[PDB]
Design a protein around this motif. Sequence first.
Motif, PDB file in Angstrom:
ATOM      1  N   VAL A   1     -32.704   0.549 104.786  1.00  0.00           N
ATOM      2  CA  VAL A   1     -32.175  -0.715 105.978  1.00  0.00           C
ATOM      3  C   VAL A   1     -31.689  -0.554 107.142  1.00  0.00           C
ATOM      4  N   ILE A   2     -32.442   0.251 107.783  1.00  0.00           N
ATOM      5  CA  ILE A   2     -32.545   0.050 109.931  1.00  0.00           C
ATOM      6  C   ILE A   2     -33.901  -0.062 109.651  1.00  0.00           C
ATOM      7  N   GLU A   3     -34.412   0.374 109.289  1.00  0.00           N
ATOM      8  CA  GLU A   3     -36.349   0.028 109.710  1.00  0.00           C
ATOM      9  C   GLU A   3     -36.162  -1.375 108.446  1.00  0.00           C
ATOM     10  N   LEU A   4     -35.410  -2.064 107.928  1.00  0.00           N
ATOM     11  CA  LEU A   4     -35.631  -3.653 107.373  1.00  0.00           C
ATOM     12  C   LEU A   4     -34.964  -3.945 108.290  1.00  0.00           C
ATOM     13  N   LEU A   5     -34.482  -3.755 109.034  1.00  0.00           N
ATOM     14  CA  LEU A   5     -33.728  -4.555 110.239  1.00  0.00           C
ATOM     15  C   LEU A   5     -34.390  -4.526 111.285  1.00  0.00           C
ATOM     16  N   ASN A   6     -35.507  -3.700 111.530  1.00  0.00           N
ATOM     17  CA  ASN A   6     -36.243  -3.319 112.401  1.00  0.00           C
ATOM     18  C   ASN A   6     -37.496  -4.448 112.615  1.00  0.00           C
ATOM     19  N   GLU A   7     -37.755  -4.626 111.324  1.00  0.00           N
ATOM     20  CA  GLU A   7     -39.063  -5.334 110.691  1.00  0.00           C
ATOM     21  C   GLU A   7     -38.815  -7.273 111.215  1.00  0.00           C
ATOM     22  N   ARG A   8     -37.260  -7.198 111.530  1.00  0.00           N
ATOM     23  CA  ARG A   8     -36.614  -8.710 110.713  1.00  0.00           C
ATOM     24  C   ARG A   8     -37.004  -8.786 112.957  1.00  0.00           C
ATOM     25  N   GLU A   9     -37.471 -10.419 112.212  1.00  0.00           N
ATOM     26  CA  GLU A   9     -37.765 -10.714 113.235  1.00  0.00           C
ATOM     27  C   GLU A   9     -36.453 -11.606 115.010  1.00  0.00           C
ATOM     28  N   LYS A  10     -36.168 -12.505 113.709  1.00  0.00           N
ATOM     29  CA  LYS A  10     -34.604 -12.245 114.690  1.00  0.00           C
ATOM     30  C   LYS A  10     -33.838 -11.235 115.052  1.00  0.00           C
ATOM     31  N   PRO A  11     -33.648 -10.744 116.734  1.00  0.00           N
ATOM     32  CA  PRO A  11     -33.129  -9.889 117.388  1.00  0.00           C
ATOM     33  C   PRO A  11     -31.975  -9.131 117.031  1.00  0.00           C
ATOM     34  N   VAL A  12     -31.876  -7.990 116.744  1.00  0.00           N
ATOM     35  CA  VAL A  12     -31.144  -6.959 116.331  1.00  0.00           C
ATOM     36  C   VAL A  12     -30.220  -6.636 116.946  1.00  0.00           C
ATOM     37  N   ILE A  13     -29.550  -6.293 117.790  1.00  0.00           N
ATOM     38  CA  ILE A  13     -28.359  -5.489 118.713  1.00  0.00           C
ATOM     39  C   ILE A  13     -27.843  -3.987 117.647  1.00  0.00           C
ATOM     40  N   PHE A  14     -28.406  -2.886 118.009  1.00  0.00           N
ATOM     41  CA  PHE A  14     -28.100  -1.686 117.941  1.00  0.00           C
ATOM     42  C   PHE A  14     -27.144  -1.010 118.689  1.00  0.00           C
ATOM     43  N   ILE A  15     -25.717  -1.028 117.947  1.00  0.00           N
ATOM     44  CA  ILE A  15     -25.328  -0.163 119.205  1.00  0.00           C
ATOM     45  C   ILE A  15     -24.443   1.326 118.302  1.00  0.00           C
ATOM     46  N   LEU A  16     -25.255   2.478 119.010  1.00  0.00           N
ATOM     47  CA  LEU A  16     -25.008   3.445 119.039  1.00  0.00           C
ATOM     48  C   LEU A  16     -24.746   4.957 120.061  1.00  0.00           C
ATOM     49  N   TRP A  17     -23.716   5.391 118.979  1.00  0.00           N
ATOM     50  CA  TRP A  17     -22.872   6.046 119.894  1.00  0.00           C
ATOM     51  C   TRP A  17     -23.224   7.537 119.250  1.00  0.00           C
ATOM     52  N   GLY A  18     -22.970   8.081 120.525  1.00  0.00           N
ATOM     53  CA  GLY A  18     -23.374   9.555 120.146  1.00  0.00           C
ATOM     54  C   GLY A  18     -24.690  10.186 119.760  1.00  0.00           C
ATOM     55  N   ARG A  19     -25.108  10.986 120.235  1.00  0.00           N
ATOM     56  CA  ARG A  19     -26.779  11.305 120.244  1.00  0.00           C
ATOM     57  C   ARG A  19     -27.287  11.482 118.171  1.00  0.00           C
ATOM     58  N   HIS A  20     -26.207  11.550 117.289  1.00  0.00           N
ATOM     59  CA  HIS A  20     -26.616  11.858 116.007  1.00  0.00           C
ATOM     60  C   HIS A  20     -26.663  10.136 115.850  1.00  0.00           C
ATOM     61  N   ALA A  21     -26.002   9.210 115.994  1.00  0.00           N
ATOM     62  CA  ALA A  21     -26.111   7.952 115.736  1.00  0.00           C
ATOM     63  C   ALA A  21     -28.320   7.250 117.056  1.00  0.00           C
ATOM     64  N   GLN A  22     -28.019   8.186 118.160  1.00  0.00           N
ATOM     65  CA  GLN A  22     -29.068   7.357 118.625  1.00  0.00           C
ATOM     66  C   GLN A  22     -30.717   8.316 118.178  1.00  0.00           C
ATOM     67  N   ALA A  23     -30.171   9.213 117.395  1.00  0.00           N
ATOM     68  CA  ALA A  23     -31.176   9.150 117.509  1.00  0.00           C
ATOM     69  C   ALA A  23     -32.156   8.487 116.001  1.00  0.00           C
ATOM     70  N   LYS A  24     -31.928   7.971 115.446  1.00  0.00           N
ATOM     71  CA  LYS A  24     -31.988   6.364 114.897  1.00  0.00           C
ATOM     72  C   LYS A  24     -32.866   5.448 115.375  1.00  0.00           C
ATOM     73  N   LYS A  25     -32.915   5.528 116.925  1.00  0.00           N
ATOM     74  CA  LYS A  25     -34.033   5.230 117.646  1.00  0.00           C
ATOM     75  C   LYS A  25     -35.379   4.872 117.079  1.00  0.00           C
ATOM     76  N   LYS A  26     -35.672   6.213 116.648  1.00  0.00           N
ATOM     77  CA  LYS A  26     -37.161   6.642 116.773  1.00  0.00           C
ATOM     78  C   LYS A  26     -37.364   5.501 115.037  1.00  0.00           C
ATOM     79  N   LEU A  27     -36.531   4.981 114.725  1.00  0.00           N
ATOM     80  CA  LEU A  27     -36.773   3.467 113.815  1.00  0.00           C
ATOM     81  C   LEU A  27     -37.100   2.353 114.212  1.00  0.00           C
TER      82      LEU A  27
END
Lengths: 225, 223, 53, 56, 53, 51
Positions: free
Chosen positions: B146-172
């Motif tokens: 789901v995150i990879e697909l939103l990453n591939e999207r042309e229209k910019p996406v805002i990601f709110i990452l609360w805590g380290r486990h959520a923030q680990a998804k920055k790699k995607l």
Amino acid sequence: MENVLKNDWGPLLATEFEKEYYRKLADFLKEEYSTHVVYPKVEDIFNALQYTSYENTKVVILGQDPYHGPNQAHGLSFSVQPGVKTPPSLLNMYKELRDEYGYEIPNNGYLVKWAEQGVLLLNTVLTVRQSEANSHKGKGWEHFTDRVIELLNEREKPVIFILWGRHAQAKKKLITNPNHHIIESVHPSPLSARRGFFGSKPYSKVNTILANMGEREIDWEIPNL
Amino acid sequence: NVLKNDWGPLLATEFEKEYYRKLADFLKEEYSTHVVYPKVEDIFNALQYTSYENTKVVILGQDPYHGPNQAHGLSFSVQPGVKTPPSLLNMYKELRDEYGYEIPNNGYLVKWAEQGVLLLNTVLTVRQSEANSHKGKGWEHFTDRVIELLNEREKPVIFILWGRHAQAKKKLITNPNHHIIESVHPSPLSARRGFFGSKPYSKVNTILANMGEREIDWEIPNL
Amino acid sequence: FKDSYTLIYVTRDEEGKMFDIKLENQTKEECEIIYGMITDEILIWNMILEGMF
Amino acid sequence: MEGFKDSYTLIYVTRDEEGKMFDIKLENQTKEECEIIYGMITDEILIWNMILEGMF
Amino acid sequence: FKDSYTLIYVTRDEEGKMFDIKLENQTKEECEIIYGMITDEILIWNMILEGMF
Amino acid sequence: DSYTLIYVTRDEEGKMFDIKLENQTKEECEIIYGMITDEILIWNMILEGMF
């Protein structure tokens, strides 16, 4: 907390009751019994001495403080009133007793039969606040129970002392007269009993000594009720 | 795959992979034997309420609330009628601080999802009273996609990452056109180390204004 | 840091019903997230590091 | 009790990067005070034990 | 050894009534004697050395 | 009935041990307690399925 002692303990302990430490203990306990639930019942505090005179004392079994739950304590170390579950420490005492003589585990923890035959069931601390073990440690009780031990030490007729655990064994410093018999082991608590209480044969060791002194042996069997 | 919107076609190939089939078998057994949250029909509600097209902000959670009548397939949201979890109360307190909105009498966040807030837990099921009981069963292969697909999207996406486990998804989130808003978790055990005053809501709406996009009305109504 | 904890907690709801929960292999952060999910009264909250020494 | 703020016994054990260890026991702490103390700890937590005083 | 412990325990009687007890400054042996006095169901038994480090 | 058992000891050299057991009977916990000669820092028995 008045000297209600009907036997030879009355005169023997009279000087203890007139000391300052005892008056302050008595005032503390007067307040404690008004404000909180304290065990045992005030009229039962001295039952160990009442049931077992200085003269008739053959064996002393030291405890800590009374059981701290309802309908448990009645002024004897280890004993509980009829009607309540046997504490694990007493159950282990019953299991060592089964091992020695084959007696089944009784349906009660009531040990007045032992006291009537000269087993002084003396806690070192004689009161406790409900649900607070050692709440009445360091209030004066051990000045009083130390004096009970000192008097038995001064007795010419040999006394048998059963000292279970280090706190009971620390009272050896009062037992300076070498005519007295000392039986020692770890405490019958489930947390210590397997480190030397099971197989310690305290009961037959006592009766062996009483036979060698020409004294009547103790019938340890506790009847069902 | 009960997905009624553009997520359905986009995720179709994910549903046919081996990991997903074994996850589905595991969850079929789990729902028969134990109480599992949320209700099977609610598992994908975050995707159902918030299409690929309409997604403006992703707020990642862990796993669903694990008590009765709590989870309904959204991160952080609880059904009307139950107490607001402390994490959500802290989110409401930061919201009061930003816009003056009083603390709502419920934790129901469907209004956020309807305006393009994808409330995505990384793990989408849980056994009753056992937090993280469905960690490492395959769910994060699915939510990673789901995150990879939103990453591939042309229209910019805002990601709110609360805590380290959520923030680990920055790699995607390798596409640098996307906006990442980061802070400690709103949990009472971490919120005082930077969640209060982090202004996640106005930061989002500042970005949506700069993109010419309709701003989010964060106000949660009383029920 | 090993960052793997046993989490043992006891809660009580409004009806007075009580819950005893033991979780293993939790990160510090997972314990913090779980704490943030709890609406019931917390009687006990106990984090213990697995393999301290 | 009803009408009074809850209070907690707090017992915790930490270890710093040198391996030096700290044991602390506090009583009569509010929930909020325990949360503030938790947030101040940068050392490794070995034990964190909050216990409600007068559970029953 | 310092031989001074905090003792925290929770019991339940036959009626299902529950007791939360905290004692301080107990010797190891005092904790063992207290354990031997308990006939109620033990839910928690926690001995912690006072001044470990 | 069964217990989770968590305990921490220290020997005379100051070396420290952490043990965590599950599914221990009351009696098994009592046997383990009776084997410990090192200094006890923590002894924690917790009933599994209290409620």
